[PDB]
Write a protein that binds this ligand. Structure first.
Ligand SMILES: OC[C@H]1O[C@@H](O)[C@H](O)[C@@H](O)[C@@H]1O
Ligand SMILES: OC[C@H]1O[C@@H](O)[C@H](O)[C@@H](O)[C@@H]1O
Ligand SMILES: OC[C@H]1O[C@H](O)[C@H](O)[C@@H](O)[C@@H]1O
Ligand SMILES: NS(=O)(=O)c1ccccc1F
Ligand SMILES: NS(=O)(=O)c1ccccc1F
Ligand SMILES: [Zn+2]
Length: 257
């Protein structure tokens, strides 16, 4: 199956997922000089005060922190979005060293990692139906740079030893995702895709301009995870990012003047 190595990685995905060469693939490079302020964007609303986290899972590609999406609790609305988008999970992409790991780039700069908070449009009723729609998903992307520790990330870091290998999960209740945000909600937005197979072109991307800082020790613990299952030869879970794809017939809009 698909993965990130030289034999099953991003350059191979198109053979089983031909949309990999499609017209609105993600991630992209964000050329900050070409991005334009868009006065039609409404204020962005990140409303996570009632979020209900449930579980953390090593899925063999990354780890997902999963939420109760059975009602409207943690949601995203406003900005480029029509209506209501429920939070279902977050995960990260990261590198083998600090100089790479992000999926989006900023004037070709690669960050050490990138956080994706994944939401689905409730008008469509379930995630599977949402991924049959052009406007089914909204992903809030946040860059990570290495510097001071992020206190709101430490609970995630410390549970990773219990989910080292593919298929392991652990309870992860009472986690507040608000602790993963930066101060500013300035953002860039464009229409794109899932960044892993099946690469479906359903996503409104909202990428925050301000990175969060995490410590070297925090990201080093991400890099101790394994792609493989228990008992199998160890393959460190690193470099689980797709490189930037062609922008094609798109424009990146900015929320700020
Ligand atoms: O426990 C994490 C978070 O869970 C939410 O459901 C609560 O309303 C928040 O006050 C709390 O910070
Ligand atoms: O025709 C002019 C229009 O061109 C579009 O490509 C831009 O997105 C708009 O901001 C602009 O007003
Ligand atoms: O909030 C996420 C998790 O953080 C810590 O691991 C707590 O010990 C655990 O009870 C909680 O589920
Ligand atoms: N297209 S793919 O899913 O990455 C893939 C799957 C299995 C073997 C080789 C491959 F390249
Ligand atoms: N990395 S992403 O685009 O947020 C993503 C989210 C959900 C499923 C597959 C994905 F690829
Ligand atoms: Zn992602």
């Amino acid at each position: 199956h698909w993965g990130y190595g030289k034999h099953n990685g991003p350059e191979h995905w198109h053979k089983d997922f031909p949309i990999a060469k499609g017209e609105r693939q993600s991630p992209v490079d964000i050329d900050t000089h070409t991005a334009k302020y868009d006065p039609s964007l409404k204020p962005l609303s990140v409303s996570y005060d009632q979020a209900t986290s449930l579980r953390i899972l090593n899925n063999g590609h990354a780890f997902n922190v999963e939420f109760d999406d059975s009602q409207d609790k943690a949601v995203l609305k406003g900005g480029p979005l029509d209506g209501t988008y429920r939070l279902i999970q977050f995960h990260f992409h990261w590198g083998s060293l600090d100089g790479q790991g992000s999926e989006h780039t900023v004037d070709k700069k690669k960050y050490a990692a990138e956080l994706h908070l994944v939401h689905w449009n409730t008008k469509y009723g379930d995630f599977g139906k949402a991924v049959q729609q052009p406007d089914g998903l909204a992903v809030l992307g946040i860059f990570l740079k290495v510097g001071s520790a992020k206190p709101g990330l430490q609970k995630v870091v410390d549970v990773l030893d219990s989910i080292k290998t593919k298929g392991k999960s652990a309870d992860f209740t009472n986690f507040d995702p608000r602790g993963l945000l930066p101060e500013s909600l300035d953002y860039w937005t464009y229409p794109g895709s899932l960044t892993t197979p099946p690469l479906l072109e359903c996503v409104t991307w909202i990428v925050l301009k301000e990175p969060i800082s995490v410590s070297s020790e925090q990201v080093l613990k991400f890099r101790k995870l394994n792609f493989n299952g228990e008992g199998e030869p160890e393959e460190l879970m690193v470099d689980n990012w797709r490189p930037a794809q062609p922008l094609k017939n798109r424009q990146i809009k900015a929320s700020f003047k």
